Design an enzyme around this catalytic site. Structure first.
Site, PDB file in Angstrom:
ATOM      1  N   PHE A 157       6.638  21.834   2.991  1.00 53.55           N
ATOM      2  CA  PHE A 157       5.196  22.037   3.044  1.00 53.55           C
ATOM      3  C   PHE A 157       4.516  20.718   2.726  1.00 53.55           C
ATOM      4  CE2 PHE A 157       6.090  26.423   3.387  1.00 53.55           C
ATOM      5  CZ  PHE A 157       7.131  26.691   2.508  1.00 53.55           C
ATOM      6  N   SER A 203       0.801  -1.218   0.000  1.00 56.26           N
ATOM      7  CA  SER A 203       0.000   0.000   0.000  1.00 56.26           C
ATOM      8  C   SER A 203       0.839   1.277   0.000  1.00 56.26           C
ATOM      9  CB  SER A 203      -0.923   0.009   1.223  1.00 56.26           C
ATOM     10  OG  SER A 203      -0.171  -0.033   2.424  1.00 56.26           O
ATOM     11  N   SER A 250      12.604   9.449   6.638  1.00 54.02           N
ATOM     12  CA  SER A 250      11.522   9.416   7.618  1.00 54.02           C
ATOM     13  C   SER A 250      11.110  10.866   7.844  1.00 54.02           C
ATOM     14  CB  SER A 250      11.988   8.827   8.952  1.00 54.02           C
ATOM     15  OG  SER A 250      12.204   7.434   8.861  1.00 54.02           O
ATOM     16  N   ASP A 272       6.289  -7.213   2.000  1.00 64.53           N
ATOM     17  CA  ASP A 272       5.488  -6.655   3.075  1.00 64.53           C
ATOM     18  C   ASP A 272       5.056  -7.739   4.045  1.00 64.53           C
ATOM     19  OD1 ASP A 272       3.848  -4.758   4.516  1.00 64.53           O
ATOM     20  OD2 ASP A 272       3.612  -3.669   2.618  1.00 64.53           O
ATOM     21  N   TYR A 296      14.195  24.183   8.749  1.00 67.39           N
ATOM     22  CA  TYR A 296      14.568  23.993   7.352  1.00 67.39           C
ATOM     23  C   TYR A 296      14.631  22.561   6.847  1.00 67.39           C
ATOM     24  CZ  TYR A 296      15.522  28.972   6.881  1.00 67.39           C
ATOM     25  OH  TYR A 296      15.411  30.342   6.802  1.00 67.39           O
TER      26      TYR A 296
HETATM   27 CL   LIG Z   1      15.701  10.460   7.390  1.00 69.61          CL
HETATM   28 NA    NA Z   2       3.323   0.805   2.055  1.00 70.89          NA
END
Ligand SMILES: [Cl-]
Ligand code: NA
Ligand SMILES: [Cl-]
Ligand SMILES: [Cl-]
Ligand SMILES: [Cl-]
Ligand code: NA
Ligand code: NA
Ligand code: NA
Ligand code: NA
Ligand code: NA
Ligand code: NA
Ligand code: NA
Lengths: 208, 208, 208, 208
Positions: free
Chosen positions: D177, D15, D131, D36, D144
């Site tokens: 953003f 997904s 991440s 997965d 930033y």
């Molecule tokens: Cl990272």
């Molecule tokens: Na995924």
């Protein structure tokens, strides 16, 4: 350089390459005499091709029969301009094709001789069909030819022999690959027409 | 005129010209069956080439082994469209290359025969590799050829023999100069593809 | 594709085609070693051609003399890139030209072998001059050649023999007409340069 | 410069960005292995994507599970050309994304090492996903960047570490953003493909 108006005698004209050649030539404006055995179906085919086509019942290996056929051609169309040997396409060497061709060439040359020369001085055109020698798995030089050789080997000599009369002699031979692609008349017919329309081709053998 | 979708059986496919041909063809969209001896490394190579390539363990000089290989090819890809003989490239005359090639040609012809003809009527393509006769310092006519002659001399005859089934037969021979420039697979592979994509090439020997 | 920077050993370089070839090559940026007999005038000619030309006193039919000449070439210019056989142009068959050429080819091949290959993989170029067989009024096949045949017939074989080392072998033969127009070096020299600059010419005989 | 024919292993492929990347790559001619967790719905998705997609049940933080997944990929498609880490996108620092990525990179590098180099010498491509560190209203330098920094900071070093094997390493990071414009997979997928097709991008972080 046009077959329109020309009179062509086609041996083995009741079917196969002969019939295909007749249909093509007649469709192009020429007149055709289908020379074939009685009961070959040549009578029906000549009828279907129109009033520019007649059937001359005859065995090409018979000089007398061919004379009768040429007389019919002259009686119906006035003369003989082209001869296409497509008949038969003892046994293996002197087969119907070779014997019929030699008989036709010897007799039609005299007829074509009476014609008045054209611009280039030609009085007639004779087109032969080489006999096919079925591939037997031979290796070496013999593998490079698909014809028996009798008619093919006589092409240039006969062309030289009839040059004084203004008669061109050409021969159509098979290619090395049956082009069967399974287990072409049109192509053969188109080649006949092309040979007739090109006064520069003489004494040569062309593989289809 | 595209190798995309075609299934090709390549003898000696685990390495050398065979492997190079497989990589090229598979990279071009075709499927390949690497026919080679067990433990030749063909299993690993077939794996690395992707799901459009399989390994058929077999000795090309064995009819039964080749039958098993062709059955595997049909079982995995449905049919055999092309055969490329690259294996082995008593002792000198009847070497692995000549024996494997004749064995493959005799067996694959029947398989290719079952295929439906294409536009031009072809059912298959067979490409052979001439055996190299190492230069021994000979002078005269013998110096003008780099191949043994067995496969090369059989090319046209076999092409004529399989013409009715629509199977083209071509052979790739070495040039007179090792082109070693020291003491090319890609070129050979590109030539294989080019032969497969040109339906007009048949019964000929092309020097690389 | 440029003779600039190349080192050429030219037998019979003190005069005739040899000298003409040296002048041309040196004028084009190459270095030349005039290999000729002592007192042939080669010392004076080498001097006049500049510091890019040296004289190697030697008899081409002597292996030891040629070794000394090649050592001088390496000692003065670093290596041997090209060999041009123009010397001598028992008695008639094993003449100075044939013997000197074979001796030079056998020895220079090893030297050229040490060179690093170029883009196309060539390490050297050897150019030979066919011996002229004076016209004696013969008719038939013999009239179609102006050379003895020894060097000419060995050209392709030697080219094939040295292919692995990346050495091209070419031969320049006389035309059938003395082109004397009375009773050309420049043309010969220009052909030598052209052969050296075209990496595609190998194992062939070119008539001037 | 084409993803056609390439085999890609995509973590978190059942997904989100992972699935979107798989659909895009498979739609472009590549093969994909959805790596997965069991019951993630990866089995159904792999099925729906066609025979060029398979499901490899596994937890990316488990070395043994990833080995099994790579073995499945090799067993089904022959090799691994690309790895795309999209899984997980103790707790905050060593999260599933960072741990799964490092585990995948360490294991797939060895696999990609067995591949034969391409024109430019590349054996594989690894693409990571940074991440996201949720914006907490910080002011100053911390404002930033939108990523945690672990994967991002390891990008160049890992690219340098795998350079000898010809494996490119790139990372995709979030923009400042959310581009949520409310409270894009396609864009991410297109960027993955673009990175794979440009052999000049290596050791860099690209913000989406
Ligand atoms: Cl990272
Ligand atoms: Na995924
Ligand atoms: Cl004949
Ligand atoms: Cl051979
Ligand atoms: Cl000579
Ligand atoms: Na007929
Ligand atoms: Na009679
Ligand atoms: Na091989
Ligand atoms: Na057997
Ligand atoms: Na001289
Ligand atoms: Na000596
Ligand atoms: Na584990």
């Amino acid at each position: 350089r046009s077959v329109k108006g020309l009179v062509a005698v086609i041996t083995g004209g009741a079917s196969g390459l002969g019939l295909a050649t007749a249909e093509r030539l007649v469709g192009q404006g020429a007149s055709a005499v289908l020379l074939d055995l009685p009961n070959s179906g040549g009578e029906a085919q000549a009828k279907k091709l129109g009033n520019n086509c007649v059937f001359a019942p005859a065995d090409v290996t018979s000089e007398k029969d061919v004379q009768t056929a040429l007389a019919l051609a002259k009686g119906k169309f006035g003369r003989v301009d082209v001869a296409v040997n497509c008949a038969g396409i003892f046994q293996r060497v002197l087969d119907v094709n070779l014997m019929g061709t030699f008989n036709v060439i010897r007799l039609v040359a005299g007829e074509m001789g009476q014609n008045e020369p054209d611009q280039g001085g030609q009085r007639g055109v004779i087109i032969n069909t080489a006999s096919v020698a079925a591939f037997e798995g031979q290796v070496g030089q013999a593998a490079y030819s698909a014809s028996k050789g009798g008619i093919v080997g006589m092409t240039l000599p006969i062309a030289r022999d009839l040059a004084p009369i203004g008669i061109r002699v050409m021969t159509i031979a098979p290619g090395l690959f049956g082009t069967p692609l399974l287990t072409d008349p049109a192509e053969y017919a188109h080649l006949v027409q092309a040979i007739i329309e090109n006064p520069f081709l003489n004494g040569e053998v062309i593989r289809l």
